[PDB]
C-alpha cells in the first residue's frame, strides 16, 4: 500500500520500525489520488475479458532474487562413474553422481512389501559382484581360472565342489575386512542346522 502511495505521489515512503505512521493515514493519502483506500482495484479476466467478482489487492512490491536456481539443481544419472573404494555411484552433481537410497527409503520399501524392487535397487541398479566360495570352508579363497574352466580353494584341498554366489561389492569389502580382522565370515548355501 505505502509503495503504491509512494509510486503515485512520487515520494519514497518512510518505512522505519518505530514511528507514528499508521494505516489510516496511508489509506487517506491513497484515497486522495483517486484509487481505493484499501488497496483493492477492479480487475478483468485475461481469457474472457470479464470483470472479476472480487476486487484484487494490486500494487507494487519490492522483491529479490535468491541464489537458488533450477539450472544448478536438476540432474539425472543413468549408468555413470563409480567410486574407487566401494565401486558405488559417486557423490556430487559435478562428478555425475547418483541419488542416495538411504536406510529410511529401504524401510519404506519394506513397509510396502516389495522385495524384488529392493533386491534390484540394491544389486543391478547399484553394484552386483559374482564370487566363488568353497564347500568345506565358506571363504573366498577359491582361485578361479575359468579361461580353461579351472578352480581351486587354497588350504582345504578342493577342486570339484565350488559354489557361485552374487553378492554386492560392499558386502565383499565387509567380508575381506573381516578376514583382514581375523574374523571368518563363512558362507554356506545349504542349511546344516535344519
Amino acid at each position: 500500500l505505502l509503495s503504491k502511495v509512494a509510486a503515485l505521489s512520487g515520494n519514497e515512503g518512510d518505512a522505519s520500525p518505530f514511528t507514528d505512521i499508521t494505516v489510516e493515514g496511508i489509506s487517506k493519502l491513497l484515497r486522495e489520488h483517486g484509487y481505493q483506500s484499501r488497496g483493492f482495484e477492479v480487475m478483468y479476466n485475461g481469457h474472457t475479458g470479464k470483470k472479476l467478482m472480487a476486487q484484487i489487492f494490486f500494487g507494487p512490491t519490492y522483491y529479490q532474487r535468491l541464489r537458488h536456481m533450477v539450472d544448478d539443481k536438476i540432474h539425472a544419472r543413468a549408468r555413470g562413474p563409480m567410486q574407487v573404494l566401494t565401486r558405488q555411484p559417486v557423490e556430487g552433481r559435478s562428478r555425475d553422481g547418483g541419488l542416495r537410497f538411504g536406510e529410511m527409503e529401504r524401510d519404506c520399501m519394506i513397509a510396502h512389501g516389495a522385495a524384488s524392487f529392493l533386491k534390484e535397487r540394491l544389486m543391478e541398479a547399484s553394484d552386483a559382484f559374482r564370487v566363488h566360495i568353497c564347500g568345506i570352508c565358506g571363504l573366498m579363497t577359491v582361485i578361479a581360472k575359468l579361461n580353461h574352466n579351472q578352480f581351486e580353494c587354497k588350504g582345504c584341498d578342493n577342486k570339484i565342489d565350488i559354489y557361485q554366489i552374487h553378492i554386492p561389492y560392499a558386502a565383499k569389502l565387509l567380508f575381506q575386512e573381516l578376514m583382514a580382522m581375523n574374523i571368518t565370515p563363512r558362507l554356506y548355501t545349504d542349511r546344516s542346522r535344519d
Binding site: 505505502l2 502511495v5 509512494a6 505521489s9 515520494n11 519514497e12 515512503g13 518512510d14 505512521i21 493515514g25 496511508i26 493519502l29
Partner: peptide, 15 residues
C-alpha cells in the same frame, strides 16, 4: 508519511 529527502534545499534556504 514519506522520507523527506529534500533537506538540502531547506537547509540551504534556511542557513
Amino acid at each position: 508519511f514519506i522520507k523527506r529527502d529534500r533537506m538540502r534545499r531547506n537547509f540551504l534556504r534556511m542557513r
